[model samples]
Target: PWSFKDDRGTTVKLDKVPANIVAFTGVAAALFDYGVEVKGVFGPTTTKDGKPDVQAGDLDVDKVTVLGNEWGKLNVEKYASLAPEVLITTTFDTAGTLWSVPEESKDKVAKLAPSVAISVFDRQLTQPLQRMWELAESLGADMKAKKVTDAKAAFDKAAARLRAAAKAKPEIRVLAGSASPDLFYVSGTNLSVDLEYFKALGVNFVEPSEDAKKATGGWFESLSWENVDKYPADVIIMDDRASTIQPADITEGTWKQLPAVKAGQVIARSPEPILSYDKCTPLLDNLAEAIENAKKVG
Candidate 1:
């Protein structure tokens, strides 16, 4: 028997352990690290040129069936063909909407099998990381495996390194943002799992007020490209999703003039983080390295 209680308070049960699993690309990526092979995946799994997207961490793009490659879209017929024993996805909000599952086809998809949603919104990142490993264990992963144990230990060390860096450079301020062609979203750490955890680990982030975030569902403050300089952060972490404009491609004059940009103090951030110690250890270490090397440019 296999059963796991998800963050949504739903206990997904099966008479036998599920072999054919289907999940969002990010979840599948984490499961892959835990030695679980998902039969199918949805969400931003591949690029237009047929290579893996940034969110498809360690997932061999050619092996798994990709049901959809964009947000709010899924091929239900193709998904059903996989004969998935379980469906897993992350929930980014309290509303509990399946993160990448198409709303129009959610119920149809759910009818095929029990679905598990692990909430990633408004909580520390560690909670979801532990939950993912627990889910993997229920799916027959070896919790005592040397690879898993080493990765977990590495994550703790990386977190401590980040904490020490933050304490050493208490004045270093980090700004998290996502860029579009017309809008640059300055994020508030209050609603994101990674940002909240990073903050708890002593990271100093530049935050937008509730009033400023009201226009963007209290998650971010959308600024025009011309006003992206509103936050004076010593280091800037920009979204690395394929949907967002990469830092190197941002040609806006205002963007180039920022102190962090001019000082080469910018780094990539995974907005949709893979919940595995192996993947996340670097997220902490990169920011720690950036903070340690940052100049007082802001």
Candidate 2:
């Protein structure tokens, strides 16, 4: 029998997991990565028309219950009806509350059943992931925990090597934006702090909103090229698809005045998702490649 303490510090003993497990967090991806089978999920996987799968998709939708429309919050009644052994919910970056589980409601809910609150959006991923493994183990999903731990170690080792190759005098910068320049977000200490690949290489990130006093949540921000002067960035990185209009389009307009473009320092753009709290092995590889391939500012 495997036993562990619940978040409230209560001893929980489980020889095996309950079939009815409810996932209120996006951490299901980690579960799936570990080949764990969850009984129910507390969210939907599609839009009003139901085209492509939104969030995690139909497979998850099929395996779970769509517990109302509230995100970053929990409905105790709905959660209770399912009678889940453990209810997993995540903390929202913006709210910084108990995953919207109010202070008054904590004791009441804990009495109802164990509710594990996870924060996967914080500055580092190691702890978040370690939390996932610990949670899985606590729930008698030791196999799942082992799977994710193994995968994490592999990624960490590969990242160590990539870091070694990026040593250079001038640090690279990241300028994040959208296709039409309508919205842009810049990377901050959030993801940057966890990027061992960048940390090992001494890569520094410069975002317009970052300052000594405050650090914004969004990895990047939206800005007009006239405001491009706000970021003295070395490498202007945008999703390749967003930059289809041409760097000249971004540059010719207001962005042209930016130092990086003026000096020709910008390099390849990755249309694929890059910066994320979950920097899995594949995404980390892309980031490493992007930094390695970046050219000097002309």
Candidate 3:
């Protein structure tokens, strides 16, 4: 028998290590690190080249069943047919609501299998990262594997480098934002997992305005293209998701007025699932490099 309590503090007991797992793309990618294979996967919001997502790691969606690619959409009938034992996903709220599952379909999905969640919202990456490792261990993942240990070491090294870079360039500012044809959304570090992680790593994140905090639940501040230059930042990390508005889409904006844009300091990076140490390391290294190379323009 296998049983484990999720981050929600609910103990889930299983007859055995769940083999027929249906998980979100991010969860599946993280599980893949421990050599665990999921039966099906869902979410990425959008796909490129008819595949799941490159950021989801080397998951061959062609091999696994694709339940849904868009948020709030899932193939309930298809998922039921798989005889899934467990449905795993990430959470962004305190109530432990699954991230991409639409509320209308929550009851239907719940009836299919016992839902398990890992919290990713409003917390540092380490919290969920360790929890995932614990879950993987319960599922018989080899914690002592060279790949696992090596990845952990690499992550430590990268984090050290990032901390040093932050200390070295304390004046540099980083902005995590998403763009669209008509509007730009500046994310509040406390509301986004990756942005919060950046702040925890000592990366200087641009704080969203108080007006924005009050209006948007501290999530993001929506601004018109005319006011895109309102936030001054040394490095701009725009969302790299396929659904995010492309740079070319903002034609009428004064985005060109931003020094980061002019200096090519705009890094196209979206929030990602850093469940595994290896996945987390590259992100830190990239941020460290960006922080070190950034020239103060604000």
Give the winner by TM-score. 1
The clash count of every prediction, one per candidate, is 0, 13, 0
lDDT of 3: 0.81
Of 1 and 2, which scores higher on TM-score?
A: 1
lDDT of 1 by residue, 1-298 (tens): 9889898898888999999999999999999999999999988888888888978999998999999887777798998899989999999887888888988888999889889999999999999999999999999899899999999999999999999999999999999999999999999999898999999999999999999999878999999999998989999999999789999999999999999999999999887889999999989999999999999788
Candidate 3 lDDT over 1-298, as tens digits, reads 9998998888889888898998887788888888888888877733667755645676666777878886556788989988999988888887888877767888998898897899987788878888998888888899899999898899889989999999999999998888876678888788676677778878888888767767777788888888888878999888866567755554653787789988988776657664888777877888899999999997
The better candidate by lDDT, 1 or 3, is 1
Q: Give the worst 10-residue stretch by lDDT in candidate 2.
A: 270-279
Where model 2 places Cα greater than 4 Å from the true spot, the runs are 1-16, 43-59, 68-70, 73-77, 92-96, 100-112, 120-123, 142-150, 168-170, 175-183, 190-201, 207-229, 234-279
Score each candidate by Cα lDDT.
Answer: 0.92, 0.51, 0.81
Off by over 4 Å in 1: none
Best lDDT among the predictions, by candidate number: 1
lDDT string, candidate 2, 130-153, tens digits:
666676655545543555556667
Q: What is the C-alpha RMSD of each candidate to the true structure, in Å?
A: 0.9, 6.5, 1.7
Native-to-model Cα distance after best TM-score fit, residue 137 in candidate 3, in Å: 1.7
Worst 10 residues of 1 by lDDT: 67-76
Sort by lDDT, best first: what order? Answer: 1, 3, 2
